[PDB]
Ligand binder design. Sequence first.
Ligand SMILES: O=C1C[C@@H](C(=O)O)NC(=O)N1
Ligand SMILES: [Zn+2]
Ligand SMILES: [Zn+2]
Ligand SMILES: [Zn+2]
Length: 362
Amino acid sequence: KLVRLPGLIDVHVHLREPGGTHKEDFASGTAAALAGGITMVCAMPNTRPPIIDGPALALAQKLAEAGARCDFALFLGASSENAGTLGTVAGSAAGLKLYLNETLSELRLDSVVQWMEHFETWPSHLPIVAHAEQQTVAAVLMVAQLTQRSVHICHVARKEEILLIKAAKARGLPVTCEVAPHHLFLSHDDLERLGPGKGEVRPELGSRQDVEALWENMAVIDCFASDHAPHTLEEKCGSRPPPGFPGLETMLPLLLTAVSEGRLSLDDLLQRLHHNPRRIFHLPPQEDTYVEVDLEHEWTIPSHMPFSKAHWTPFEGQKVKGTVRRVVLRGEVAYIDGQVLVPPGYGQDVRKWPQGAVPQLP
Ligand SMILES: O=C1C[C@@H](C(=O)O)NC(=O)N1
Ligand SMILES: [Zn+2]
Ligand SMILES: [Zn+2]
Ligand SMILES: [Zn+2]
């Protein structure tokens, strides 16, 4: 007996196109999404070239429309040069992404004043998300308060961070956050097995106490999101390993296993992979869209999942219970039992749908 879920949303994926298509492209990354029970993705802007201006966004929009197999929105990226220049295209993006710690030279901000400038100039009704670790979480919260608006904190990974966000929510501040599966299901205990190359990710893997704090404080977590960050094994195992794990194909099986064990409820899962992504990012419903999962099937995660071009996974060897059997996307069978059945280009930019525009005062 299968369970019907709504179309799940992953608000944090790196699909590498343009410029890193050996790691992933729209077609392969959205195949991975569908196989993971995800029907809508929000793609991050740290591509090559990065999505930091209108021409780059225009290119990325067309590449996605031609390659995506599920629906999508594209983030814009903040740079040291683009504050005050994005107003005409801002509403066409998923939101604005700030990279406040390590990142590409093009997305590096060297001063909190530049963060300020972005919070002041980006349209106040549109989402802002920040990669902000440890004290950077408190710093960007301060900037959000000074500019009187909300912020969403990406991939919270530490006890310190979730407790700071908890304290901010207790003071009524408009902050939301997401957590990625590797920060719920992997820890320092796994670094022996992974090694120092494969184990590289930002935010880094936490201690057992970090992991336990995130579970303890599930009420504080608004969204789950993969931070799908595909890199090839050659890159992960080489001399300058880039941070990041692939995660689209493993996220839902890992979380269904947790539901099975009573660690969170099905509703808790659906708030975090459907309702809260919708409401934080103003993402539209998808008509005639659903995912059928089998909650009894026990399997072991292999050395690589079928679809991501990353061709490896840090969850190799973990035993899971739960599998995606079928995905229907806008009335068409998109995935069944290991086969993706919609072509590249079936997916659409949800920000172009009438119901996908963010409401604003005239
Ligand atoms: O901040 C990031 C970005 C990402 C990537 O590879 O694009 N991977 C990470 O591990 N952290
Ligand atoms: Zn990040
Ligand atoms: Zn994020
Ligand atoms: Zn990311």
